[PDB]
Design a protein around this ligand. Structure first.
Ligand SMILES: CC[C@H]1OC(=O)[C@H](C)[C@@H](O[C@H]2C[C@@](C)(OC)[C@@H](O)[C@H](C)O2)[C@H](C)[C@@H](O[C@@H]2O[C@H](C)C[C@H](N(C)C)[C@H]2O)[C@](C)(OC)C[C@@H](C)C(=O)[C@H](C)[C@@H](O)[C@]1(C)O
Ligand SMILES: Nc1nc2c(ncn2[C@@H]2O[C@H](COP(=O)(O)OP(=O)(O)O)[C@@H](O)[C@H]2O)c(=O)[nH]1
Ligand SMILES: [Mg+2]
Ligand SMILES: [Mg+2]
Length: 296
């Protein structure tokens, strides 16, 4: 195959020598095609073949976030792009498997959704508490979005007005959104470095369902940490949200009395993210997903 021979040559050009029979393709990918391959010392790698120009400006923020994680974090792994060029990005595969993969819509689960091991919530609590306390201020140059607690609140307020302008928002839903925005007690008084896209496809687990790593850091930023709890609530209901909040609080993560209620209101604002995604991607189902999510 030509594809295979191409993978081999781009790797070879970056001093990566692979077993040809181990090369698997993960279908593009507007930005890049993911390729998995084992080098000749037997080490599993992940390759990102770029499909757009300006790889460096487009990956700058994700790389800065990864540099912070690889410099500070010990409880979990993250991609370490030891090959980082316009022609190729490559990192040694993280240990474990995704807790679940998105259907190519629904999850194909690796854990028992009806009997979630408590170690998943315990280890994820430790992982996010460490992540969210990484000292991103100590970096000389950070191009991530950085919110104070009040900036994180206005950001949501503005993002909500913009979605209402392009799609409209159901009256009951909009009133809920506004009530949340206008409740001082609910909002966190501390922000932190977040992953931004925490879900089962990005949480690497070992055999015991300990979360051992996190992939795909494109949504990283310094803002409300609550975004990283939403998956537990969507996938596992109130029990899994509480279990995660409990472990995060007891290992030292920033906790506030209305944390659960705040995260649940952030969940009701998920149509904002779906609307925003439908806007910068043009994929037809997400417009219908957006419109139906907005109750319009
Ligand atoms: C429980 C089960 C359901 O899972 C979820 O609710 C997750 C916990 C989501 O994260 C929640 C929580 C959230 C924080 O993200 C992790 C939040 O941003 C998001 C909108 O919804 C997803 C992972 C969202 O993806 C994310 O949508 C973003 C718009 C862009 C992100 N990425 C940069 C490409 C992308 O991964 C997605 C839209 O679902 C609704 C994915 C879409 C394929 C579906 O509709 C799925 C069929 C889902 O209904 C689901 C599997 O059945
Ligand atoms: N097991 C494992 N899978 C990975 C790793 N990196 C990427 N993948 C898989 O490849 C997919 C795409 O990688 P990702 O970084 O999320 O890029 P994107 O989803 O295409 O934008 C993921 O959903 C994973 O299933 C890794 O280190 N370990
Ligand atoms: Mg991904
Ligand atoms: Mg991404």
């Amino acid at each position: 195959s030509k594809d295979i021979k191409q993978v081999i040559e781009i790797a070879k050009k970056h001093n990566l020598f692979l077993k040809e029979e181990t090369i698997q393709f993960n279908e593009s990918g507007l930005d890049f095609q993911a390729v998995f391959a084992q080098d000749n010392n037997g080490i599993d790698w992940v390759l990102r073949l770029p499909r757009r120009e300006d790889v460096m400006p487009r990956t700058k923020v994700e790389k800065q976030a990864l540099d912070l994680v690889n410099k500070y974090a010990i409880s979990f792994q993250a991609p370490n792009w030891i090959i980082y060029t316009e022609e190729l990005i490559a990192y040694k595969k993280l240990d474990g498997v995704p807790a679940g993969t998105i259907d190519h819509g629904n999850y194909i689960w690796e854990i028992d959704i009806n009997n979630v091991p408590e170690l998943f919530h315990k280890s994820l609590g430790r992982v996010l508490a460490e992540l969210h306390s990484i000292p991103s201020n100590k970096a000389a140059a950070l191009d991530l979005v950085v919110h104070t607690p009040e900036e994180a609140r206005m950001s949501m307020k503005q993002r909500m007005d913009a979605v209402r302008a392009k799609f409209g928002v159901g009256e009951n839903l909009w009133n809920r959104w506004q009530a949340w925005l206008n409740d001082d007690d609910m909002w966190p008084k501390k922000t932190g470095l977040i992953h931004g896209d925490v879900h089962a496809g990005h949480t690497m687990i070992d055999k015991d369902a300990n979360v051992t790593g996190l992939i795909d850091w494109t949504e990283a930023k310094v803002t409300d940490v609550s975004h990283d709890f939403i998956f537990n609530y969507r996938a596992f209901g109130e029990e899994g949200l509480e279990a995660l909040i409990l472990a995060y609080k007891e290992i030292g993560g920033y906790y506030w009395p209305k944390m659960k209620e705040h995260i649940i209101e952030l969940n009701a604002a998920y149509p904002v993210s779906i609307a925003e995604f439908a806007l910068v991607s043009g994929i037809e189902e997400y417009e219908q997903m957006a419109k139906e999510a907005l109750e319009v």
